[PDB]
Amino acid sequence: DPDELPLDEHCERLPYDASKWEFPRDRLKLGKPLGRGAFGQVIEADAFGIDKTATCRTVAVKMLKEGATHSEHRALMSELKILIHIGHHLNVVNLLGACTKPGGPLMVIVEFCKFGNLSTYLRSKRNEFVPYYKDFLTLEHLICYSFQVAKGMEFLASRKCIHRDLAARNILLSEKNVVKICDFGLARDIYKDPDYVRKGDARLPLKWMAPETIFDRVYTIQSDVWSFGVLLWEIFSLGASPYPGVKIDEEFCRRLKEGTRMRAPDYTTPEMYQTMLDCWHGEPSQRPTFSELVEHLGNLLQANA
Ligand SMILES: COc1cc2nccc(Oc3ccc(NC(=O)/N=c4\cc(C)o[nH]4)c(Cl)c3)c2cc1OC
């Protein structure tokens, strides 16, 4: 079914309306790099007037770096088109503009999320956590983050997109405890990142991948639900690495097929752990949908109050 088909697949037919999205290069001041991959990078910048008249705005800019080729340039352009087509949501990193004019690099400009990726943030807060003192993390915050990511994913699903690398490292934290789904893509160095394992010529986030994705190489929204379950484990471990100490080999993949699951993380509630287990159902059609996760986490959020 073409309607099931992720817009990600046929991006080349998506419009780029420059009269709306093009931002003048002479209004963007590039600062220091925030992160770098092999072929891509994200740079901190100040954009003059990009979202509000005459207002300086700190933004993040994704662009390529030494090593990239025309194929990565094409990939970044497709990413830009995808972001445009998806549209705005509180819990997805918001596109502000782009520089596509010849004579300089392709630049994708998005809102700056000052606290960075959620995994690192949660670990820096282990010292400042109480289950139920200002600036302290609490259980309510953890549930609220989970709810927000479910909302963003429900939204992405509704725009006919699937993420394919959902993990705490791809969630960013902005001010006022708002989290945003991201995909660093080329701006992450995956051959240097332990989270990505060599399988063939590819490097894959095995510890986050559903069984059907590992064995049959199928990516669906329900396999994102499986990954969301792992993300939940990350959140309620305050940013621990999944399957700690475990060797991620073919025996690991088999155990996973058999029904082996992670034990509960140190900060979970019973209901949150059952939710993870639900997300990790061997049968994809028996996992909850993101719509159901949204309703359920909202209920948990209210009960925790
Ligand atoms: C404080 O430190 C950082 C703050 C950041 N704040 C905002 C954005 C950042 O990096 C990006 C991460 C991802 C994308 N792209 C992106 O998310 N593309 C998508 C997402 C989806 C669904 O389809 N395409 C971009 Cl442009 C930029 C940041 C990186 C930081 O430190 C490294």
UniProtKB/Swiss-Prot annotation:
Annotated consequence of substituting P284S: In HCI; somatic mutation
Outcome reported for the amino acid change (mutating Y133F): Strongly reduced autophosphorylation. Reduces phosphorylation of PLCG1
Locations listed in the record: Cell junction; Endoplasmic reticulum; Cell membrane
Positions annotated as active site in the UniProt record: D165 (proton acceptor)
Modified residues (Phosphotyrosine): Y133, Y191, Y196
Domain named Protein kinase: residues: 28-299
PTM field: N-glycosylated.
Disulfide bonds: C161-C182
Tissue/organ expression: Detected in cornea (at protein level). Widely expressed.
Effect caused by changing Y191F: Strongly reduced autophosphorylation. Abolishes phosphorylation of downstream signaling proteins
Oligomer and partners: Homodimer in the presence of bound dimeric VEGFA, VEGFC or VEGFD ligands; monomeric in the absence of bound ligands. Can also form heterodimers with FLT1/VEGFR1 and KDR/VEGFR2. Interacts (tyrosine phosphorylated) with LFYN, NCK1, PLCG1. Interacts (tyrosine-phosphorylated active form preferentially) with DAB2IP (via C2 domain and active form preferentially); the interaction occurs at the late phase of VEGFA response and inhibits KDR/VEGFR2 activity. Interacts with SHBSH2D2A/TSAD, GRB2, MYOF, CBL and PDCD6. (Microbial infection) Interacts with HIV-1 Tat.
Disease: Hemangioma, capillary infantile: A condition characterized by dull red, firm, dome-shaped hemangiomas, sharply demarcated from surrounding skin, usually presenting at birth or occurring within the first two or three months of life. They result from highly proliferative, localized growth of capillary endothelium and generally undergo regression and involution without scarring.
Family statement: Belongs to the protein kinase superfamily. Tyr protein kinase family. CSF-1/PDGF receptor subfamily.
Name of the protein in its database record: Vascular endothelial growth factor receptor 2
Lineage: Eukaryota, Metazoa, Chordata, Craniata, Vertebrata
